[PDB]
């Protein structure tokens, strides 16, 4: 059965006005800004941006890739697809 989300989990993450996007749940570094309550730090592959999102916008990668893991025109998307498939746990700073 499913657990709660934890750092390292891979997802497609949904934000208004964008396609479901390859992403991961990030750790929060020591001394770094924490997300609001009930939100997770989401790192978007390809763009390398962070946003704070709740579970309603988080789709587990394995279950969802057949639907959401196809190339898209949007800036950073296809790079994102490579990263999530090939090195999802790397440092992208």
Swiss-Prot record:
Residues 7-64 form the PWWP domain. It comes from the Eukaryota. It is found in: Nucleus; Cytoplasm. Widely expressed. High expression is found in heart, skeletal muscle, ovary and testis. Overexpression is frequently observed in hepatocellular carcinoma samples. Interacts with HDGF. Interacts with trimethylated 'Lys-36' of histone H3 (H3K36me3). Interacts with trimethylated 'Lys-79' of histone H3 (H3K79me3), but has higher affinity for H3K36me3. Interacts with IWS1. Interacts with H2AX, POGZ, RBBP8 and CBX1. Interacts with histones H3K9me3, H3K27me3 and H3K36me2. Interacts with DPF3a (isoform 2 of DPF3/BAF45C). Interacts with SMARCA4/BRG1/BAF190A, SMARCC1/BAF155 and SMARCD1/BAF60A in a DPF3a-dependent manner. Belongs to the HDGF family. Acts as an epigenetic regulator of myogenesis in cooperation with DPF3a (isoform 2 of DPF3/BAF45C). Associates with the BAF complex via its interaction with DPF3a and HDGFL2-DPF3a activate myogenic genes by increasing chromatin accessibility through recruitment of SMARCA4/BRG1/BAF190A (ATPase subunit of the BAF complex) to myogenic gene promoters. Promotes the repair of DNA double-strand breaks (DSBs) through the homologous recombination pathway by facilitating the recruitment of the DNA endonuclease RBBP8 to the DSBs. This is Hepatoma-derived growth factor-related protein 2. It comes from Homo sapiens (Human). The chain holds residues 1 to 93 of 671 of the full protein.
